[PDB]
Structure formats: structure tokens, C-alpha cells
Amino acid sequence: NSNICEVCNKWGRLFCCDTCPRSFHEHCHIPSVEANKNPWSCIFCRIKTIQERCPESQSGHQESEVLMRQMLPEEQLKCEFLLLKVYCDSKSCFFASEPYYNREGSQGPQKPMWLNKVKTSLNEQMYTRVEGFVQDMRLIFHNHKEFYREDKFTRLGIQVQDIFEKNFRNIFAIQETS
């Protein structure tokens, strides 16, 4: 197995996947690395299994149909994985914890949102459809773009949204278009 966390790229107290060489800090993995379970298979492995059991799941889908899906176990897992792929980018640090807003010429968003809040919401089974998770994720970046206006820091929102959207299209097998 790797000697660094797959998500934050640091060493430390690492839990190793039994079916692939990745490793994780306990609370870097999503869901948090399970107490017992021998063998243990990481979320990467669990997602690859879904695909392998239903190869047709990789055919193109319309975003509108994906969003309306209820959060059954496989969709819960897919949203957990997509959230983890965003934490995998170091620029996620800016969006992880609860933000505050005091900038001359701007007013804070009406509905603040952040990664750790989305993480808690998934853990608590608060989303009933894929749409709820996706709307909170996109709200993170939209709030950022609106608040930072012409400051060049707006770009961090565009960058991390791009990581979210590429991973959304991959994980939920969105039909490719120009």
C-alpha cells in the first residue's frame, strides 16, 4: 500500500485498502473508515464494483434524470465519492470550513454553504435525491463567485467547481456532448 493518504497526501495514522494499494486517514475517507471490517475495501474499490456488476451503468445519462434519482445506497455512495474527489484537490481547503463575509463593497450570501456541512448532511442521510447534494455543492462555488466579484480570488471557485463538474460527469456517466 501507499505510505500517504490518497486524499490529503500526508502521512500519519493510515488505514490501508485490502483490494487496492490506496491508504487513508480515518476522516479523509468518506464515509469515515469503518471500525472493524476485515477485509476492508475503500470507496474507490466499492465504486469500481458497482460498475463491474452493471456494465451498462456506464452508458450516457441525462443530468436531469440523474438529479431526480432517490438517494438509495448506490447513489449515496456515488455522492460520497464525488465529495471525496473534491477534497482530493488541495484547493478544497478554501471551501471546507464555515466561511464568513466582511469585505467592503460586498454582502455575504443568503445561504452559506461549505464542504464539511455537505459531508455532515450526507452522513446524517439528509438528502433524499441526488439533486439536493448537487445543488448544495454548486451553491458553494456560486456563493464564492458572487461575493468575490472582480477580485482574482474568484478564480479559486471556478477551479474547484471544474473539479466537481468533471467528476460528476464521470461518476454518474453523464452523456458526453460538445
Binders of Zn ion in range 51-90 (CB under 5 A): 54
Minimum gap (Å) between residue 28 Cβ and Zn ion: 3
Which one of the spans 18-26, 126-134, 142-150, 158-166 is the region binding Zn ion (CB under 5 A)?
18-26
Please report how the helices 73-87 and 130-148 are oriented relative to each other, as an axis angle in degrees rounded to 10. 30
Least Å from the CB of residue 109 to Zn ion: 29
Strands of the chain (E only): list them: 14-16, 23-25
Rounded Cα–Cα distance for residues 68 and 65 (Å): 5
Q: Record the cell numbers describing residue 63, joined without a space.
A: 443530468
Question: How many Å apart are CA 74 and CA 12, to the nearest integer?
Answer: 30
| 31, amino acid identity | P
Q: Smallest gap, in angstroms, from Cβ of residue 61 to Zn ion?
A: 15
User: Out of 17, 84, 115, 140, which residue is the one contacting Zn ion (CB under 5 A)?
Assistant: 17
Please tell me the distance from the alpha carbon of residue 115 to that of residue 30, in angstroms, as a whole number. Answer: 12
- Does 115 sit near Zn ion (CB under 5 A)? no
- Sole binder of Zn ion in the list 1, 2, 8, 88 (CB under 5 A): 8
Site residues (CB under 5 A) for Zn ion? 5, 7-8, 17, 20, 25, 28, 42, 44-45, 54
